[PDB]
Amino acid sequence: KLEFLAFYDELTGLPNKNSLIRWLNLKVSQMDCIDTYLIFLEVRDLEKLNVTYGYDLVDELIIHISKRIKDIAGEGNKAFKIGFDRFAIICKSENISDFIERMLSQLLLPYNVNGNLIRVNFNIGAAQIEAAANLMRRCDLALIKAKEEGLNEYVIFKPIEIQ
Protein backbone atom coordinates (compact mmCIF):
# COMPACT_ATOMS: atom_id res chain seq x y z
CA LYS A 1 0.00 0.00 0.00
CA LEU A 2 0.96 3.66 -0.41
CA GLU A 3 -0.31 4.62 3.03
CA PHE A 4 1.76 2.02 4.90
CA LEU A 5 4.80 3.08 2.91
CA ALA A 6 4.15 6.67 3.91
CA PHE A 7 3.40 6.16 7.59
CA TYR A 8 4.88 2.91 8.86
CA ASP A 9 8.22 1.16 9.07
CA GLU A 10 8.65 -1.82 6.74
CA LEU A 11 10.71 -4.07 9.03
CA THR A 12 9.14 -3.13 12.34
CA GLY A 13 5.57 -2.29 11.48
CA LEU A 14 5.83 0.58 13.92
CA PRO A 15 4.64 3.97 12.70
CA ASN A 16 7.54 6.01 11.24
CA LYS A 17 8.73 9.60 11.59
CA ASN A 18 5.89 11.02 9.47
CA SER A 19 3.33 9.43 11.77
CA LEU A 20 5.30 10.77 14.73
CA ILE A 21 4.93 14.25 13.28
CA ARG A 22 1.15 14.10 12.72
CA TRP A 23 0.59 12.80 16.23
CA LEU A 24 2.95 15.48 17.54
CA ASN A 25 1.06 18.38 15.96
CA LEU A 26 -2.11 16.87 17.39
CA LYS A 27 -0.73 16.47 20.91
CA VAL A 28 0.57 20.04 21.00
CA SER A 29 -2.88 21.45 20.14
CA GLN A 30 -4.55 20.34 23.39
CA MET A 31 -4.94 22.21 26.67
CA ASP A 32 -2.65 20.42 29.09
CA CYS A 33 -0.18 17.85 27.88
CA ILE A 34 -0.30 16.57 31.47
CA ASP A 35 3.41 15.90 31.67
CA THR A 36 3.54 14.07 28.36
CA TYR A 37 7.00 13.45 26.95
CA LEU A 38 8.69 12.77 23.64
CA ILE A 39 11.49 10.23 24.05
CA PHE A 40 14.25 9.30 21.63
CA LEU A 41 15.98 5.93 22.07
CA GLU A 42 19.10 5.10 20.11
CA VAL A 43 20.45 1.56 19.71
CA ARG A 44 24.23 1.88 20.07
CA ASP A 45 26.84 0.40 17.73
CA LEU A 46 24.25 -1.23 15.47
CA GLU A 47 26.75 -1.03 12.56
CA LYS A 48 29.40 -3.08 14.32
CA LEU A 49 26.63 -5.62 14.84
CA ASN A 50 25.71 -5.80 11.17
CA VAL A 51 29.35 -6.64 10.65
CA THR A 52 29.54 -9.15 13.52
CA TYR A 53 26.24 -11.01 13.05
CA GLY A 54 25.15 -10.14 9.51
CA TYR A 55 22.22 -7.96 8.40
CA ASP A 56 19.52 -10.59 8.66
CA LEU A 57 20.28 -11.38 12.26
CA VAL A 58 20.35 -7.65 13.10
CA ASP A 59 17.02 -6.92 11.44
CA GLU A 60 15.57 -9.65 13.65
CA LEU A 61 17.20 -7.99 16.64
CA ILE A 62 15.58 -4.65 15.69
CA ILE A 63 12.19 -6.35 15.56
CA HIS A 64 12.86 -7.89 18.97
CA ILE A 65 13.81 -4.45 20.24
CA SER A 66 10.72 -2.78 18.79
CA LYS A 67 8.44 -5.31 20.46
CA ARG A 68 10.07 -4.89 23.86
CA ILE A 69 9.78 -1.10 23.51
CA LYS A 70 6.21 -1.54 22.37
CA ASP A 71 5.69 -3.82 25.38
CA ILE A 72 7.04 -1.81 28.31
CA ALA A 73 5.66 1.29 26.60
CA GLY A 74 1.99 0.43 26.99
CA GLU A 75 -1.14 0.88 24.89
CA GLY A 76 -1.90 4.40 26.11
CA ASN A 77 1.53 5.39 24.80
CA LYS A 78 2.84 5.39 21.23
CA ALA A 79 6.03 3.87 19.86
CA PHE A 80 7.65 4.77 16.53
CA LYS A 81 10.60 3.73 14.38
CA ILE A 82 12.12 6.93 13.03
CA GLY A 83 15.65 5.94 12.07
CA PHE A 84 17.71 2.88 11.22
CA ASP A 85 18.85 2.72 14.85
CA ARG A 86 16.40 5.03 16.58
CA PHE A 87 12.97 4.76 18.18
CA ALA A 88 10.56 7.39 19.54
CA ILE A 89 7.90 7.31 22.24
CA ILE A 90 5.04 9.62 23.13
CA CYS A 91 4.13 9.09 26.77
CA LYS A 92 2.16 10.73 29.55
CA SER A 93 3.88 10.16 32.89
CA GLU A 94 3.92 11.73 36.34
CA ASN A 95 7.42 10.33 36.86
CA ILE A 96 9.16 10.06 33.49
CA SER A 97 12.71 9.42 34.75
CA ASP A 98 11.69 6.19 36.49
CA PHE A 99 9.72 5.33 33.36
CA ILE A 100 12.91 5.78 31.36
CA GLU A 101 15.06 3.73 33.72
CA ARG A 102 12.51 0.96 34.08
CA MET A 103 12.47 0.58 30.32
CA LEU A 104 16.22 1.03 29.95
CA SER A 105 16.92 -1.64 32.58
CA GLN A 106 14.67 -3.94 30.57
CA LEU A 107 16.08 -2.96 27.17
CA LEU A 108 19.49 -3.79 28.62
CA LEU A 109 18.25 -7.36 29.10
CA PRO A 110 19.58 -9.97 26.62
CA TYR A 111 17.80 -10.85 23.37
CA ASN A 112 17.52 -14.46 22.24
CA VAL A 113 17.58 -13.93 18.51
CA ASN A 114 17.59 -17.29 16.74
CA GLY A 115 19.61 -18.93 19.51
CA ASN A 116 21.95 -15.94 19.45
CA LEU A 117 22.13 -14.36 22.91
CA ILE A 118 22.60 -10.66 22.23
CA ARG A 119 23.15 -7.67 24.45
CA VAL A 120 23.03 -4.10 23.14
CA ASN A 121 23.53 -0.63 24.53
CA PHE A 122 21.26 2.39 24.24
CA ASN A 123 20.97 6.09 24.99
CA ILE A 124 17.86 8.13 25.63
CA GLY A 125 16.95 11.73 24.96
CA ALA A 126 13.61 13.02 26.23
CA ALA A 127 11.65 16.27 26.13
CA GLN A 128 8.55 17.71 27.83
CA ILE A 129 5.91 18.07 25.10
CA GLU A 130 4.69 21.67 24.93
CA ALA A 131 6.20 22.99 16.20
CA ALA A 132 6.79 19.26 15.77
CA ALA A 133 10.24 19.91 14.32
CA ASN A 134 11.40 22.00 17.29
CA LEU A 135 10.41 19.27 19.76
CA MET A 136 12.10 16.57 17.75
CA ARG A 137 15.12 18.83 17.55
CA ARG A 138 15.05 19.25 21.31
CA CYS A 139 14.96 15.49 21.84
CA ASP A 140 17.78 15.09 19.41
CA LEU A 141 19.95 17.46 21.48
CA ALA A 142 19.23 15.52 24.66
CA LEU A 143 20.25 12.30 22.93
CA ILE A 144 23.52 13.92 21.88
CA LYS A 145 24.14 15.14 25.44
CA ALA A 146 23.41 11.62 26.68
CA LYS A 147 25.92 9.94 24.41
CA GLU A 148 28.66 12.36 25.48
CA GLU A 149 27.81 11.30 29.02
CA GLY A 150 28.33 7.68 28.00
CA LEU A 151 26.53 4.49 27.05
CA ASN A 152 23.15 3.77 28.64
CA GLU A 153 22.74 7.30 29.91
CA TYR A 154 19.68 9.53 29.40
CA VAL A 155 18.87 13.24 29.41
CA ILE A 156 15.49 14.98 29.83
CA PHE A 157 14.94 18.56 28.63
CA LYS A 158 12.40 20.79 30.40
CA PRO A 159 11.41 24.41 29.57
CA ILE A 160 15.21 24.76 28.25
CA GLU A 161 17.23 23.25 31.09
CA ILE A 162 19.04 19.94 31.54
CA GLN A 163 17.26 17.41 33.76
Side-chain angles (χ1 to χ4, degrees):
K1 219 302 178 65
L2 191 70
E3 198 170 300
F4 172 101
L5 216 48
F7 299 113
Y8 302 90
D9 182 82
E10 172 61 69
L11 184 84
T12 192
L14 261 35
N16 64 188
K17 187 182 285 196
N18 290 322
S19 304
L20 169 59
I21 290 179
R22 282 196 317 176
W23 272 310
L24 270 175
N25 297 329
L26 202 88
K27 284 284 187 174
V28 74
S29 305
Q30 61 198 50
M31 264 156 71
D32 289 3
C33 300
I34 172 51
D35 295 322
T36 310
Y37 301 73
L38 177 60
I39 303 163
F40 270 8
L41 294 81
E42 183 175 331
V43 190
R44 304 306 306 282
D45 310 302
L46 203 54
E47 294 189 313
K48 267 60 173 181
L49 251 42
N50 271 146
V51 168
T52 305
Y53 298 108
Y55 294 77
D56 284 317
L57 194 296
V58 177
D59 287 319
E60 258 292 300
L61 211 208
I62 295 294
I63 291 181
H64 274 56
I65 295 175
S66 68
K67 295 184 183 172
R68 187 170 301 184
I69 297 184
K70 185 141 54 66
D71 185 86
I72 90 294
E75 303 183 310
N77 294 161
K78 293 293 297 190
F80 317 78
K81 179 71 188 309
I82 59 181
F84 154 69
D85 64 357
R86 169 181 304 191
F87 292 89
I89 305 292
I90 301 296
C91 76
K92 51 181 186 181
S93 303
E94 293 178 351
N95 188 308
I96 186 202
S97 69
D98 157 64
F99 175 78
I100 287 175
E101 317 191 315
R102 193 190 311 143
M103 170 181 67
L104 190 67
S105 71
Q106 297 172 64
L107 278 175
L108 256 24
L109 259 48
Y111 296 86
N112 184 156
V113 188
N114 186 60
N116 294 274
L117 198 77
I118 307 173
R119 274 172 151 291
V120 287
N121 286 151
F122 305 76
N123 265 294
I124 286 177
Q128 183 96 52
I129 286 183
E130 194 181 8
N134 297 56
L135 277 156
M136 294 191 61
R137 288 178 163 172
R138 190 173 308 162
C139 253
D140 189 64
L141 229 186
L143 190 48
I144 298 174
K145 304 293 185 184
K147 297 192 297 182
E148 315 184 316
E149 212 71 63
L151 293 176
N152 306 133
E153 227 81 61
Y154 67 91
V155 181
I156 306 176
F157 282 161
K158 283 175 165 52
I160 70 292
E161 176 175 56
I162 334 302
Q163 210 319 74

